[PDB]
Amino acid sequence: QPAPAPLVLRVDNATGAVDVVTTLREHESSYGEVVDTYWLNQYVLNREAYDYNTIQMNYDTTALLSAPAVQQDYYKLFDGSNARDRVLGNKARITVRVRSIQPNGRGQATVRFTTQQHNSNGTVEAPQHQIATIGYTYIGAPMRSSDRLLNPLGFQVTSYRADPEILNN
């Protein structure tokens, strides 16, 4: 008789989620060229934007669509006394919309977008114009339900910057 394989399970008392100790199963794998751009556009809108009420999803989504280097740059925006969480907090919010995106090469695209600040006193600040440069790739499908239902394509930002647009019109 081979020794009964060790059997162990963990039960989350808060979510009632039951998970086997043994390593999980691998998934499907195919390469799609037009997957990085869609993930990058969704990540950019969640990243620059802010709302106390929805930010946890935008925050995790941005990280899900970011290389660890990029994730850290992003996480840091919520740190210290000047943290978005303290500056905007639940007193002010940021609305972001993308006007146009045009790929320019081998894992690189230009995103033209706007942003504006709204607040608890019912006022709105003048909108600003910004342009992001995104370096990106795809890492294929993720192997967790919490990731595949947000970024199935594997979009990942490897480099990111966004500068003010100067409206020399």
């Binding site: 946890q56 990280a63 899900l64 907090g89 192997m143």
Partner: peptide
């Protein structure tokens, strides 16, 4: 490889709105 992973932001833990 793909190495999907994160140590993401506390989403649920919002602070005391003053």
């Amino acid at each position: 490889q793909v190495i999907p992973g994160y140590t993401p932001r506390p989403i649920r833990p919002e602070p005391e709105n003053v």
